[PDB]
């Protein structure tokens, strides 16, 4: 479960490197007279691709040269005025960002970009490793350069099988997104003996590292056990600790499995999302 640190750091700066990539910002508050150059000038320091200025809006939507150099003009004129006009200055928002999970762990970030990339071209695209182990976590991103190849993606792989797992895919707000947050909170606890109800049992055994905030056993409409569970814990390294030694553990008449979920919804949320995943 040990990776070699050099397999590691390639792998984290990687992911790093792709999460960072986003070079489009949008800002807002310019004055109604502004022109391409004038914004040209406002970001001197600055090389960009891109400067395009919507006057009735007074909006201007830049391309810079990388995601460092996009990070730093935020920074800089953010909150900022131009001829007294107060500006905000952000990443440009994406609808075409995609969250897909349930992968097995072993599947590559070049395999996970050969999964997403037939559906169109794509302008991040990630596999998010343990810091640790340099191990997936089994879930990546993908940010398409259209929202109908994200739509495409997201209908295609939803549900779809791929090796002992069936993939998990959710539309992801870009822009709540940080390093930190990369790394999800809730687990998804599977391959329970069949007609496992009795709840408290999981959760203690679970609780040999950290105590989560949510433990709950899943189960329909119908009210019948649909056989998993969805766990929260109140930091992101508290649950990869607790996934990490309770992976493979013997409860019962099956070695339970422990994955992590998607990150971003809450334990309540990820298991209804996980439920409406299985419904017919």
Not at 71 to 81: D, K, P, T, V
Request: with cysteine; charged share 25%.
């Amino acid at each position: 479960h040990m990776l070699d640190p050099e397999e590691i750091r390639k792998r984290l700066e990687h992911t790093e490197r792709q999460f960072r990539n986003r070079r489009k910002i949008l800002i807002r508050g310019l004055p109604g007279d502004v022109t391409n150059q004038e914004v040209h000038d406002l970001l001197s320091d600055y090389e960009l691709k891109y400067c395009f200025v919507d006057k009735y809006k007074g909006t201007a939507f830049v391309t810079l040269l990388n995601g460092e150099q996009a990070e730093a003009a935020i920074n800089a004129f953010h909150q900022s005025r131009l001829r007294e006009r107060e500006l905000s200055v952000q990443l440009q928002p994406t609808d075409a960002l995609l969250c897909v999970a349930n992968l097995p762990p072993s599947l590559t970030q070049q395999q996970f970009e050969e999964l997403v990339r037939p559906f169109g071209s794509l302008e991040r695209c990630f596999l998010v490793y343990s810091e640790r182990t340099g191990q997936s976590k089994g879930y990546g991103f993908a940010e398409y350069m259209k929202k109908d190849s994200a739509a495409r993606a997201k209908s295609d792989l939803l549900g779809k099988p791929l090796g002992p797992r069936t993939l998990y895919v959710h539309w992801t707000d870009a822009g709540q997104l940080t390093p930190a947050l990369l790394h999800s909170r809730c687990l998804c606890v599977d391959r329970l003996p069949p007609g496992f109800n009795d709840v408290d049992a999981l959760c203690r055994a679970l609780s040999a590292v950290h105590s989560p905030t949510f433990c709950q056993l899943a189960c329909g409409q119908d009210g019948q056990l649909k056989g998993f569970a969805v766990l929260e814990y109140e930091t992101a390294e508290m649950a990869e600790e607790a996934q990490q030694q309770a992976d493979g553990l013997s409860l019962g008449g099956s070695h339970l499995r422990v994955s992590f979920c998607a990150p971003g919804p809450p334990g309540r949320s990820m298991l209804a999302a996980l439920i409406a995943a299985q419904a017919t």
